Amino acid sequence: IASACLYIACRQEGVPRTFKEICAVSRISKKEIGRCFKLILKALETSVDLITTGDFMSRFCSNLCLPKQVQMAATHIARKAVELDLVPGRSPISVAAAAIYMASQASAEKRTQKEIGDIAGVADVTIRQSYRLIYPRAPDLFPTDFKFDTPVDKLPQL
Amino acid sequence: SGIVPQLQNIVSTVNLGCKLDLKTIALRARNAEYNPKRFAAVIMRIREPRTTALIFSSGKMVCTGAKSEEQSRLAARKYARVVQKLGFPAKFLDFKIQNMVGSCDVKFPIRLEGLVLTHQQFSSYEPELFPGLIYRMIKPRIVLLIFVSGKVVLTGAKVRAEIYEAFENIYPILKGFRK
Amino acid sequence: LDLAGPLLAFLFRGMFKNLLKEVRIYAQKFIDRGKDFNLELAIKTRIISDGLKYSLATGNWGDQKKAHQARAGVSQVLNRLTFASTLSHLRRLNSPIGRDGKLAKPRQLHNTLWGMVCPAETPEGHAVGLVKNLALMAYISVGSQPS
Amino acid sequence: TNYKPVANHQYNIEYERKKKEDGKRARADKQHVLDMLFSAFEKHQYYNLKDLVDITKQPVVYLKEILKEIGVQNVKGIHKNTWELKPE
Amino acid sequence: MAYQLYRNTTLGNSLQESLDELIQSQQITPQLALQVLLQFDKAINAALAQRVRNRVNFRGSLNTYRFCDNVWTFVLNDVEFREVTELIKVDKVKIVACD
Amino acid sequence: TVPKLYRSVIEDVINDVRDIFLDDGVDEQVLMELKTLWENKLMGQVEEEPLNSEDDVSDEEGQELFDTENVVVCQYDKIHRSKNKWKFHLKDGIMNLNGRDYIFSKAIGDAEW
Amino acid sequence: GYKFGVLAKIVNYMKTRHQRGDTHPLTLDEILDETQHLDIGLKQKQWLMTEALVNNPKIEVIDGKYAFKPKYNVR
Amino acid sequence: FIQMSVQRIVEDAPPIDLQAPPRYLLKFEQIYLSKPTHWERDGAPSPMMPNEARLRNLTYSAPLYVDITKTVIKEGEEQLQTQHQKTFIGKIPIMLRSTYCLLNGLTDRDLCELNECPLDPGGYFIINGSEKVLIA
């Protein structure tokens, strides 16, 4: 109950922590945390605004030691991908991880799929799927006023 | 609307009115499996109706997998007759359908974000826990799983009319949230 | 003279013993249950964090529940009224009375304070001779191993 | 790298897998349970409920019913009131 | 008082027939026959668990299944056994498994 | 190969039963005679109470009665089924196919019901 | 096991036998046969004959044989 | 204190031994300190300047990490030794203008850039924005 309440408090304060992030600090599994989360929402007759890709960009990039320009590019890429519906049904955390990977690979500070998955709580396979979905539209997703250490046409393909 | 939900699973409960020996039923029945350590019931399966029935020592049985009410009742009767042939005084008492599950497609993508924003009081959308959106219809007590692909799954219905009414109620909302 | 370091070490050993006891209790619970335990979840960071923070904030030393015997006045808000006051507060020395102070009066200016403690600087009132200030060139040894 | 996101802890999943593999204890026949209880009675005069549950490998409630049917519990002034396998 | 799996086989049947012959001749008591059967079961279980290190595969269609007392009683039809060295075809087979 | 395994099994069996024979006090010649014979033998229904409305809802019941077909004895490490197919993960075991005796250590099986 | 795991089954089997309505007494060996204790100890036989089957309040000695005691119990 | 006493305390703390019968041993060997850091609402770490701590009523504390080695024995002639590197255990308040303070080695111009008085002698702690001096 306490872990689910902590998750709900983060969502209500507008700095959501993923269920995996809460589980990493709670002995309670993510499954039970989600069960208690839904039960608490029903009991309190309250609601939490749907999370977005930009809700985790700051934390993920800061934990990855990525520059502010890289963080901005990742946020723009994720928001543009969601707007264009390039990743329909994909989890916002997975989309954010894929966008962070794209921006990091396009910037000098390059972070591996394993690293991004470790910080974001998303498997490298899921990051690969999302990055494959968003890769074709990389030049459109990237911000107009962005400096590419590695040209967009030479981004990793996989 | 032009789309009718198709019943994918029907769950029913019946009472045989007689205490049963699960070990004997497992030993004699053709397709029965019993594992008291795992579960306290006996799981039997039949092909032509394509259904699985759990039989309890108290005499009550629960049949699932049937795609229609007639098929569910026929499969339950078959299981009861098998138990009777095994030497027990099995009967067919107070047969009832406890839950009905249906599936359908709206043939267009749906914006779950807008749907949940407009129907927060009924919609729970947690992609982390489940990609689909859980809509709890009120007037019919039906839970619907709506997916971005357009697939809609209705569950919790006791009668087919409930499934059809719930889908009819939800269809215009999904049309308004067409992507 | 117990400077910031030794005082902080005195706090740290108690708080670290509390940390080790807490992890022992958590691991004992899980082991008795029969399931392995997670070290990250077993460790309680608030023990050390809040212990040191509370001690520095309130001037009470020892655990919060042990405030009965906790020394008070070690930590004080730095005096920023003037630069000279700030320097004097940073070079201030305290002489607790306790039981030891009762046996011999420490308010008097002893001969041995020459060159170590300022002979003129001392608060007027109940604290005469108990609060002291270092001489300009006075130095307090930080300690080293006699190996 | 501390408190990295994880769906479930390694210890938790291992314990859950062990519990699932072992399964819940089943209700054995009264005759077999009684035979095991009487055979074990020879080893020691008295047994604790928990240790007897471990030995017999039966549900707590069912074992308590069987033990109530024949045996009784005696109040001991040294540790606590404990079950005595002797019905009389 | 053991697993008692391989008794209903050709080997166990031959052993049981020999024991019955000696019993008819009054050379061995039924308790001795039972003890011999128990020792044989233990020995064959150990021998199978130790000296068997060959892998095989098989495919087929399942016709019936039962599970009681932790004993699987599968009944398969049209089973093809594939091995690195040989292939076999059988119309019907009954698999009795325990653990 | 199979005969060699059988002879090794015979040796193990005699060694295992030696102590039992010594304990029960029966003469050791019984074991020799046992081995000799052992080798020789081998080589609108408103009212629903009645269930009689349906007849012949079962197949032949003598399948397990006969048991004359090939039989496989084994130990199962994991048997799981997903809505169509039974997957068998069975360890060391024996089989009697067309009279021939087969022995395997690890086997994998997929069947459709 | 020995001297304790055999008499309990005798008592239980006799109790179950009475419920069938068979008031006829039973012999020690006869009860042993149905209780699968034919290999019971030689001194256990005499111990049961002399102490267990007489001191118990549910065993009635009739014409040298043993029968249940439904008379003491309220029926 | 920071450089020697904390590490000596951690090293001298007896290893934690636990028995179930599986046996567990925990040993703490190395101590690490990061620069004073403040975590925003979103959870993004960032260096915490003393002026920022004073203004926002923060505590000038440095995260504390310890290297932990856990060895488990299950009476099966097997021993499993897993090491958690830099396990967070708490935050140590940092005396200003010390070797572990962000204003360490900074020139007077750098201090002016950081809005810190070069004549400021340091030697105190910022606890909830209050400059606390430890009296000898």
D37's tokens = 């209880």
**Between A and B, how many residue pairs show a Cβ–Cβ distance under 8 A?**
34
- State whether residue H87 sits within 8 Å of chain D by CB: yes
Reading the block at residue C64, the tokens are 């919060």
Chain D contact probe: residue of C38, C43, C44, C45 with most D CBs at under 10 A: C38
Q: How far apart are CA H22 and CA A9, in angstroms?
A: 39
- Residue C127 CB neighbours (<10 A): 13
Distances (CA, A) of F22 to C55, F17, F18, G9: 80, 9, 6, 32
Query: To the nearest whole angstrom, how far is the Cα of C30 from the nearest Cα of chain A?
Result: 11
Chain E nearest CA to F67, separation (Å): 8
Cβ atoms A140, A80 nearer than 8 A = yes
Alpha carbon distances (Å) from E64 to E76, E95, F61, H2: 7, 10, 11, 73
Query: b/e string for B73-96 if b means 16 or more Cβ within 10 A?
Result: bbbbbbbbbbbbebebebbbeebe
* Other CB atoms within 10 Å distance of the CB of residue D88: 7
Do H and F count as touching (3 or more CB pairs closer than 8 A)? no
Kindly state the tokens that stand for H62.
């440095």
What is the per-residue DSSP string for F1-64?
Answer: -HHHHHHHHHHHHHHHHHHHHHHHT--THHHHHHHHHHHHHH---------TTS---S--S-HH
- Which among B64, B97, B130 is the end of a domain? B97
E97 vs E71: CA distance, rounded Å: 6
Query: In A, residues 34-63, which contact B (CB 8 Å cutoff)?
Result: 34, 37-38, 41, 47, 50-51
Q: Which 3 state secondary structure label does DSSP give C57?
A: helix
Q: Please, what is the angle between helix A57-64 and helix A113-120, to 10°?
A: 130
Interchain CB distance below 8 Å, C36 and D2: no
Amino acid letter for position B123: S
- Tell me the shortest Cα–Cα distance from C43 to chain A, in angstroms: 11
Longest dimension (CA), chain F: 77
Distance in Å, alpha carbon of G6 to nearest chain D alpha carbon: 9
Contacts of D19 in chain A (CB under 8 A): none
User: Are residues B17 and B93 both part of a single domain?
Assistant: yes
Q: Which amino acid is at H22?
A: P
Query: Residue E66, by phi and psi: left (phi above 0), alpha (psi -120 to 50) or beta?
Result: beta
Q: CB distance D41–G4 less than 8 Å?
A: yes
Point out the domain boundary residue: B43, B72, B97. Answer: B97
How was this structure obtained? cryo-EM
**Could you tell me the domains of chain E?**
1-53 (1.10.287.190), 54-99 (2.30.18.10)
Angle made by CA atoms H7, H13, H15, in degrees to the nearest 5: 120
Give the count of beta carbons closer than 10 Å to the beta carbon of residue A62: 19
Q: Which residues of D touch B56 (CB under 8 A)?
A: none
Q: How far apart are CA F32 and CA F26, in angstroms?
A: 12
Q: Is A132 annotated as a binding residue?
A: yes
- How far is the first Cα of chain C from the last one, in angstroms, to the nearest whole number? 23
What is the domain-level CATH number for residue B21? 3.30.310.10
At D54, the amino acid letter reads D
Contacts with C25 from chain A: Cβ below 8 Å: none
What DSSP string runs through B6-67? Answer: EEEEEEEEEE-SS---HHHHHHH-SS-EE-TTT-SSEEEEETTTTEEEEE-TTSEEEEEEES
The answer to whether residues A34 and B129 touch, using CB atoms and an 8 Å cutoff, is yes
Closest CA to B121 of B140, B132, B135: B135
* Touch test D–E: 3 Cβ pairs or more under 8 Å: no
Q: Side chain identity at H26, as an amino acid letter?
A: L
d(CA H80, CA H70): 8
Nearest residue to C126 via CA among C99, C100, C147, C97 = C97
C26 close to H (CB below 8 A): no
Nearest chain A residue to D1 by CA distance is A119
- Give the minimum alpha-carbon distance from E73 to chain B in angstroms, rounded to a whole number: 10
Angle at B165 between CA B160 and CA B167, to 5 degrees: 100
Beta strands in chain C (DSSP E): 75-77, 92-94, 131-133
**Residue pair B30/E62 in contact by the 8 Å Cβ criterion:** no
Q: What angle do CA H56, H59, H65 make, to 5 degrees?
A: 135
DSSP label at C117? B
Q: Is B113 at the interface with chain E, CB within 8 A?
A: no
Count CA atoms within 13 Å of residue D30 on its CB side. Answer: 12
> Which single residue is written with the structure tokens 């968003």?
A134
Q: Say how far apart CA D14 and CA C35 lie, in whole Å.
A: 8
Within this chain, do residues B132 and B179 fall inside the same structural domain, yes or no? yes
Given a contact cutoff of 8 angstroms between Cβ atoms, the answer to whether F55 and B84 are in contact is no
Chains that touch C (3 or more CB pairs under 8 A): A, D, H
Query: How many structural domains compose chain G?
Result: 1
State the Cα–Cα distance between residues D80 and F112, nearest whole angstrom. Answer: 59
Q: List, in sequence order, every residue forming a beta bridge with B136; answer none if it has no partner.
A: B143
Q: What residue of B is the nearest CA neighbor of D25?
A: B37
Spatial separation of the C-alpha atoms in residues C84 and E49, rounded to whole Å: 88
Do at least 3 CB pairs under 8 Å connect C with D? Answer: yes
Long-range contacts, G66-70 (Cβ 8 Å, 24+):
G66/G14, G66/G25, G66/G26, G66/G27, G66/G28, G66/G31, G67/G23, G67/G24, G67/G25, G67/G26, G68/G14, G68/G15, G68/G17, G68/G18, G68/G23, G70/G18, G70/G23
SS3 assignment for chain G:
CCCCCCHHHHHHHHHHHHHCCCCCCECHHHHHHHHCCCCCCHHHHHHHHHHHHHHCCCEEEECCEEEECCCCCCC
> Is D34 near chain G, with CB under 8 Å?
yes
The DSSP secondary-structure symbol of C81 reads: S
Pairing verdict, β C75-77 and H130-134:
antiparallel
d(CA B33, CA B44): 6
Answer yes or no: are the C-beta atoms of C133 and C91 closer than 8 Å: yes
In angstroms, rounded to a whole number, what is the distance separating the alpha carbons of residues H61 and H38?
Answer: 9
Q: How far apart are CA A63 and CA A66, in angstroms?
A: 8
Closest by alpha carbon to A3, among A24, A20, A26? A26
Entry resolution in angstroms? 7.3
| φ, ψ (nearest 5 deg) of residue A10 | -60, -45
SS3 C16: helix
Show the DSSP H helices in E1-99 as ranges.
10-24, 30-51
Residue C76 identity: Q
Phi and psi, residue C53, nearest 5°: -65, -45
Q: How many CA atoms lie within 13 A of A89 on its CB side?
A: 13
B contact test, residue of A46, A50, A56, A94 with most B CBs within 10 A? A50
Write out the binding residues of D.
77, 79
Q: Residue B119's domain spans which residues?
A: 1-11+98-179
Residues contacting F58, CB < 8 A, separation 6+: B30, B82, B85
Alpha helix stretches (DSSP H) within chain A: 2-13, 19-25, 30-44, 57-64, 68-84, 92-106, 113-120, 124-134, 138-141
Q: Which chains touch A (3 or more CB pairs under 8 A)?
A: B, C, D, H
Q: How far apart are CA D62 and CA D60, in angstroms?
A: 6
Q: Answer whether D13's CB lies under 8 Å from A32's CB.
A: no
Structure tokens at A122: 């998303």
Which residue in B85, A39, B127 sits closest to F58, CA to CA? B85
Chains linked to E by 3 or more Cβ pairs within 8 Å: B, F
CA–CA distance, F38 with E76 (Å, rounded to integer) = 32
Rounded CA-CA distance A125/E56 in Å is: 34
- Report whether A147 belongs to an annotated binding site: no
| Relative orientation angle of helices A92-106 and A57-64, to the nearest 10 degrees | 40
Question: A58: which chain H residues are within 8 Å (Cβ-Cβ)?
Answer: 40, 42-44
Residues within 8 A of A (CB atoms), B 140-179 only = 147-149, 179
Which amino acid makes up residue D58?
Answer: Q
Query: Could you tell me which of B128, A94, A30, C41 has the C-alpha nearest to residue D8?
Result: A30
Distance CA B95, CA B90 (A): 13
Measured distance CA(C21)–CA(H26) in Å, rounded: 12
Nearest CB among B109, B120, B129 relative to A88 is that of B109
The residues in B 7-66 lying below 8 A from E, measured between CB atoms, are 23, 26-27, 29-35
| Ramachandran angles phi, psi of C86, nearest 5° | -60, -45
Q: Dihedral of the CA atoms B19, B23, B28, B29 (nearest 10)? A: 70
- Based on C-alpha coordinates, what's the Rg of chain B? 20
| Tokens at A76, concatenated | 């723009």
Count C/D contacts: CB-CB distance under 8 Å: 17
Based on the fold, state whether residues B169 and B110 are members of the same structural domain: yes
Binding residue per annotation — A154? no
| Closest by Cβ to F49, choosing from B47, B74, B91 | B91
SS3 at position E94 = strand
Asked whether the beta carbons of B80 and B91 are under 8 A apart, the reply is: yes
Alpha-carbon separation of residue F48 from B59, B78, E55 (angstroms)? 17, 13, 54
**Residues 6 or more apart in contact with residue D42 via CB below 8 angstroms:** G1, G2, G3, G4, G5
Cβ(H97)–Cβ(H121) below 8 Å: yes
User: d(Cα B88, Cα B84) in Å, to the nearest integer?
Assistant: 5
Name, in order, each residue with C-beta under 8 angstroms of A153's C-beta and a sequence gap of 6 or more. Answer: A139
Please indicate whether chains C and B are in contact, defined as at least 3 beta carbon pairs under 8 Å: no
Instruction: Say if residues H88 and H64 touch (Cβ distance below 8 Å).
Output: yes
**Residue B106 and residue B49 in contact, taking contact as beta carbons nearer than 8 Å:** no
Say which DSSP state E3 is in: -
Q: What whole-number distance in Å separates Cα of residue F31 and Cα of residue F8?
A: 16
Residues 100-119 of B with CB under 8 A from A: 109, 113, 116-117
Q: Is F75 exposed, middle or buried (0-12, 13-18, 19+ CB in 10 A)?
A: middle
- Please list every residue in chain E whose beta carbon sits closer than 8 Å to the beta carbon of residue B29: 66
Question: HSE (CB half, 13 Å, CA atoms) of F96?
Answer: 17
Interface chains of chain F (3 or more CB pairs under 8 Å) = B, E
Dist. CA A29–CA D13, nearest whole Å = 9
Instruction: Give every CB contact of residue A156 below 8 A, 6+ residues apart in sequence.
Output: A105
Q: Can you tell me which residue has the tokens 């509390």?
A: C18
* Backbone CA torsion sign across A143, A148, A154, A157: negative
The whole-angstrom separation of Cα A19 and Cα D5 is 8
Q: Kindly state the tokens that stand for F49.
A: 């109470």
Q: Report the 10 Å Cβ neighbour count for C6.
A: 15
Among B66, B97, B128, the domain boundary falls at B97
Q: What would the CATH number be for the domain defined by D22-84? A: 1.10.10.10
DSSP letters spanning D11-77: HHHHHHHHHHHH-PPP---HHHHHHHHHHHHTT-SB--HHHHHHHHT--HHHHHHHHHHH-EEE--S
The torsion region of residue H49 among left (phi > 0), alpha (psi -120 to 50) and beta comes to beta
Whether B172 contacts B106, CB under 8 Å: no
Which of C53, C55, C94, C116 is the best residue to mutate to test the H interface, defined by the most H CB atoms within 10 Å of its own CB? C53
**What is the chain F residue with the closest CA to B48?**
F57
Close Cβ partners of B77 (under 8 Å, ≥ 6 residues apart):
B92, F51, F53, F54
- F29: tokens are 């010649």
**Closest partner CB to A20 (pick from D1, D5, D12):** D5
Q: Do G1 and D42 touch (CB under 8 A)?
A: yes
From the DSSP assignment, how many helices (H) and strands (E) are in chain C?
Answer: 5, 3
Instruction: Give the other-Cβ count within 10 Å of A144's Cβ.
Output: 7
- Of A23, A25, A27, nearest to D7 by CB-CB distance is A23
Is residue B99 part of an annotated ligand binding site?
Answer: yes
Q: How many CB atoms lie within 10 A of CB B43?
A: 17
Q: Do B71 and B19 belong together in one domain?
A: yes
Domain that holds residue G57: 4-75
Long-range contacts of H11-15 (CB under 8 A, 24+ apart): H13/C16, H13/C17, H13/C20
Q: Judge: D3–C40 Cβ closer than 8 Å, yes or no.
A: yes
Q: Are residues B138 and B92 in the same domain?
A: no
Joined together, the tokens standing for residue A39 give 């039960």
Q: Is residue C30 helix, strand or coil?
A: helix
Q: How would DSSP label each residue in A111-153?
A: --HHHHHHHHT--HHHHHHHHHHHGGGHHHHS-TT---SS-GG
Would you give the DSSP letter of residue H15? P
Q: How many contacts does E have with F, using Cβ atoms within 8 A?
A: 164
Strand duo E87-98 + F70-81: pairing: parallel
**Residues of chain C contacting A, Cβ within 8 Å:** 38, 40-41
| CA–CA separation, B123 and H132 (whole Å) | 53
As annotated, the binding site of F for DNA includes 80-81
How many structural domains compose chain B? 2
Chain H contacts of C12, Cβ < 8 Å? Answer: 1, 5-6, 9
Q: Least CB-CB distance to F58: which of B80, B82, B95? A: B82
